[PDB]
From a paper:
Similar to other ABC permeases, the SBP [name] defines the specificity of the uptake pathway. However, our recent studies showed that the functional specificity of the Psa permease in Mn2+ acquisition arose not from the specificity of Mn2+ binding by [name], but instead resulted from the concerted action of protein metal ion coordination chemistry and structural rearrangements that prevented release of other divalent transition metal ions, such as Zn2+, into the permease, despite their ability to bind to PsaA8.
We further analysed the metal-binding site coordination geometry by use of an Asp280 variant isoform ([name]-[name]), as it would be incapable of facilitating the trigonal-bipyramidal coordination observed in wild-type PsaA8.
Numbering used by the authors: 32 to 309
């Protein structure tokens, strides 16, 4: 079978929904770990060296900081846009501090569903190019999968559009929800910016408290993958409850709620639409 490597569980899950058992699939970053600044293990090196097709997020997720993915493909003698492909190719990129420069792309594109669809379309295209025998199969799965994502996307947009606008603010610890904000029409507020060295300092917490005091936002949220003590402090200091934990950069373990890209997103969308309507 085609040997495929995905850098993280979101990409791997989307890939599974396109390819089913037609491929040999290895995922590098395990469920619940952070795909930024990961350390590949020997099995990852072996699988990537053997791979026919390699998918990564791109837009600086795996190539910033320690640039682990770059090191991995260079050692594996794999070539950009021949062996390995950024599944974010084609997304409408957001830049940190709104400054369009290479390296300032915000990586968190999958947190709106239109980009999950783009991810899937890129995955299907490259599976089909490397394994034409199964092209019809990949394309059928692509349509089914992207239909599923599109329905959820439209339903969620309809819900957000109904919420009184004074309540519409997505508050999280890290500013990782800017693509979500763009797509669903819900402005972002947060304790610390992407790629900040110190997470959850007194300066940062105070800043967010002072902003939220002037708002009517009814719920805050917290990422399952961050230390929740800064947001708990913000919650206490503003008297705004934390409604839910939400997913950011990983699906959940198999069998749990959110154990696929689709169900991860449905959980997020469901909890945030619920929480902001309070």
């Amino acid at each position: 079978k085609l040997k495929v490597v995905a850098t993280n569980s979101i990409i791997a899950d989307i890939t599974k929904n396109i390819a089913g058992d037609k491929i040999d699939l290895h995922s590098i970053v395990p469920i619940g770990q952070d795909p930024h600044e990961y350390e590949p293990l020997p099995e990852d090196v072996k699988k990537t060296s053997e791979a026919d097709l390699i998918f990564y997020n791109g837009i600086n997720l795996e190539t910033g900081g320690n640039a682990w993915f770059t090191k991995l493909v260079e050692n594996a003698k794999k070539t950009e846009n021949k062996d390995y492909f950024a599944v974010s190719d084609g997304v409408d990129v957001i830049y940190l501090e709104g400054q369009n420069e290479k390296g300032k792309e915000d990586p968190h594109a999958w947190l709106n569903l239109e980009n999950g669809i783009i991810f899937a379309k890129n995955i299907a295209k490259q599976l089909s190019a490397k394994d034409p025998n199964n092209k019809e199969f990949y394309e059928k799965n692509l349509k089914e999968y992207t239909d599923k994502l599109d329905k959820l996307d439209k339903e969620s947009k309809d819900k957000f559009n109904k919420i009184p606008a004074e309540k519409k603010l997505i508050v999280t610890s890290e500013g990782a929800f800017k693509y979500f904000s763009k797509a669903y029409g819900v402005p972002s507020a947060y304790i610390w910016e992407i790629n900040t060295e110190e997470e959850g300092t007194p300066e940062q917490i105070k800043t967010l408290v002072e902003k939220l005091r002037q708002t009517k936002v009814p719920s805050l949220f917290v990422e399952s993958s961050v230390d929740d003590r800064p947001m708990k402090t913000v919650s206490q200091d503003t008297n705004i409850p934390i409604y839910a934990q939400i997913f950011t950069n990983s699906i959940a373990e198999q069998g749990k709620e959110g154990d696929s890209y689709y169900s991860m997103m449905k959980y997020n969308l469901d909890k945030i639409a619920e929480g902001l309507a309070k």
